[PDB]
Write a protein that binds this DNA or RNA. Structure first.
Ligand SMILES: [Mg+2]
Ligand SMILES: [Zn+2]
Ligand SMILES: [Zn+2]
Ligand SMILES: [Zn+2]
Lengths: 56, 290, 55, 143
RNA sequence: CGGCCUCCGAACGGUAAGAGCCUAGCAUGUAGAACUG
């Protein structure tokens, strides 16, 4: 099976990449761009899992 | 596009182990020459050797019959210029862009009419194998084809990655050696190839039997026979090559003289025998008598 | 995987009482006499409007 | 301040002695998390996180099974509050896996051929000892 | 004792087209590297 990672793995990845202007990444550039086509799906999945005002 | 089975390249470029690890990536890249998108294969040739990759269009490779990753021929391993010129070949390789696209397309259609055994087109009908090219071939494997690059880090001292460096921690060749500038296009077309040009200066340093002056001197002096050489055996050696006008085997010299009735027979025979005459395992030397 | 619930009636009655203000306080269908679907389908098919209904 | 805790109920009565090491490890993980992306590397910048994760979880694995010094209810609570790692523990239960570097290095899909990464191979099988830092963890021979 | 209540904004369509030169960008991260009695 596929086992889950600790949250700091992704938190660190995203923090590192910041906003892709540093030249270190610069191949992510084109994959980052290619993932645009699926961005309206991430938004739908985000908004339908909204947290419901009786929860913090 | 192409979608195929496996890459054809020199066994030197294949590597040492009898079991290979090759991963297929469909339409992975465009040929450095053809720019046709072709399926690329990746292979790990050995431990701590750089991973090799299929490097040219399948059609472009079936055309010229070279190591589809090492760029060297599949038969002897000779660069295009040298192999062709020693085979007496003057090929019209396309260099134009539009004519190049059309040419690689038509050549893929011809390779489609071909059956996967012989190199398609003229590249086969020059199959008179040249001993100069044979002797110019590296007879043992040159696995230096997979030695890693230099790590600029350790080249300034900086490679603190340990032995995990993906480059050989060796002093970099100061670029001036023309062996550094072999672009894929240069090495493919075989034009302005200075490694093959050094190979050509070598082939000019390689000894053949230089012809003597007097057009009546058809006396070929054989050296290094031993006492186990027979007169009739040397006659059978130089027999089908033309008319042997006289045999004179000097046992007190371990030498001999074959007088020929045809100057062409004498010349072609000596040239075919130069440093290659092997009778009873003896390293026989052909010369022109005085 | 959180499908298929099963409750008891004490639960269901407390749930009912809490949801009491979001709910409709009628027991039957006679309220929606000329205000049900088939009434609105017929109204639409005849291009006439009910006092409180759609056009 | 702490790993602000979702369960809202009282952590059991063995929690206050595991507290200090846990917290200091947490602030430690925050420092290794913030250590910023200099000429460091990219493939090697996630290694400290797997160190400290393995460390957190090996700690709570000690304080339960090896010493028997924690109640099982406190144990499952420390699982639920993200101090422990369920699947790391659940592999560590197996035979050959005492020192698993992380859960991924045995995920076979992440490699092309569907085999574990060389991190898993014992050192005896090599017999040549070329130092290997597994790309995923950075580990050097977990088992 | 009947009720009857629209419309709300954006793009193109006008301010040219170029040939050249100059200089960061942007792509690669390559292939392969000497031979004797
Ligand atoms: Mg107009
Ligand atoms: Zn390991
Ligand atoms: Zn590993
Ligand atoms: Zn690991």
């Amino acid at each position: 099976q596929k086992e889950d990672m600790p949250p700091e793995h992704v938190r660190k990845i995203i923090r590192d990449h910041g906003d892709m202007t540093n030249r270190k990444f610069r191949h992510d550039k084109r994959v980052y761009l290619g993932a645009l086509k699926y961005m309206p799906h991430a938004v739908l999945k985000l908004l339908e899992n909204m947290p419901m005002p009786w929860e913090q | 596009w192409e979608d195929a089975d496996f890459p054809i390249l020199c066994q030197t470029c294949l590597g040492e182990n009898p079991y290979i690890r090759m991963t297929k990536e469909k339409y992975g890249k465009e040929c450095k020459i053809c720019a046709r998108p072709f399926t690329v294969f990746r292979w790990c040739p050995g431990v701590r050797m750089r991973f090799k990759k299929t490097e040219v269009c399948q059609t472009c490779s079936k055309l010229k019959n070279v190591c589809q990753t090492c760029l060297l021929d599949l038969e002897y391993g000779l660069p295009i210029q040298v192999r062709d010129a020693g085979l007496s070949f003057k090929d019209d390789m396309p260099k134009s862009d539009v004519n190049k696209e059309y040419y690689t397309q038509n050549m893929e259609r011809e390779i489609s009419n071909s059956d996967g055994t012989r190199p398609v087109g003229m590249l086969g009908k020059a199959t008179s194998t040249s001993d100069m090219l044979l002797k110019l071939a590296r007879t043992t494997p040159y696995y230096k084809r997979n030695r890693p690059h230099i790590c600029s880090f350790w080249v300034k001292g900086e490679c603190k990655r340990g032995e995990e460096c993906p480059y050989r921690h060796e002093k970099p060749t100061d670029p001036d050696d023309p062996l550094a500038d072999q672009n894929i296009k240069d090495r493919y077309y075989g034009i302005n190839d200075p490694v093959a040009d050094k190979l050509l200066k070598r082939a000019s340093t390689m000894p053949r039997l230089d012809p003597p002056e007097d057009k009546t001197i058809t006396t070929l002096y054989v050296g290094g026979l031993g006492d186990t050489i027979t007169e009739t055996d040397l006659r059978n050696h130089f027999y089908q090559f033309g008319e042997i006008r006289t045999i004179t085997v000097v046992q007190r010299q371990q030498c001999a003289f074959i007088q020929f009735a045809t100057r062409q027979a004498a010349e072609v025979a000596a040239e075919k025998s130069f440093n290659k005459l092997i009778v009873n395992g003896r390293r026989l030397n052909v010369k022109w008598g005085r | 995987t959180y499908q298929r619930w099963q409750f008891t009636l004490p639960m269901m009655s407390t749930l009912y009482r809490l949801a009491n203000q979001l709910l409709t306080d009628l027991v039957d269908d006679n309220y929606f006499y000329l205000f049900d679907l088939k009434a609105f389908f017929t109204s639409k098919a005849l291009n006439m409007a009910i006092p409180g209904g759609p056009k | 301040m702490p790993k602000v805790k979702r369960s809202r109920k009282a952590p059991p009565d063995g929690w206050e002695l595991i507290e200090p090491t846990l917290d200091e490890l947490d602030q430690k993980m925050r420092e290794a998390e913030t250590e910023p992306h200099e000429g460091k590397r990219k493939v090697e910048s996630l290694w400290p996180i797997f160190r400290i994760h393995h460390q957190k979880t090996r700690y709570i694995f000690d304080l339960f099974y090896k010493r028997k010094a924690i109640s099982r209810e406190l144990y499952e609570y420390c699982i639920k509050e993200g101090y422990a790692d369920k699947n790391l523990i659940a592999k560590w239960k197996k035979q050959g896996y005492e020192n698993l570097c992380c859960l991924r290095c045995i995920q076979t899909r992440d490699t092309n051929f569907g085999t574990n990464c060389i991190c898993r191979v014992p050192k005896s099988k090599l017999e040549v000892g070329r130092i290997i830092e597994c790309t995923h963890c950075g580990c050097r021979g977990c088992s």
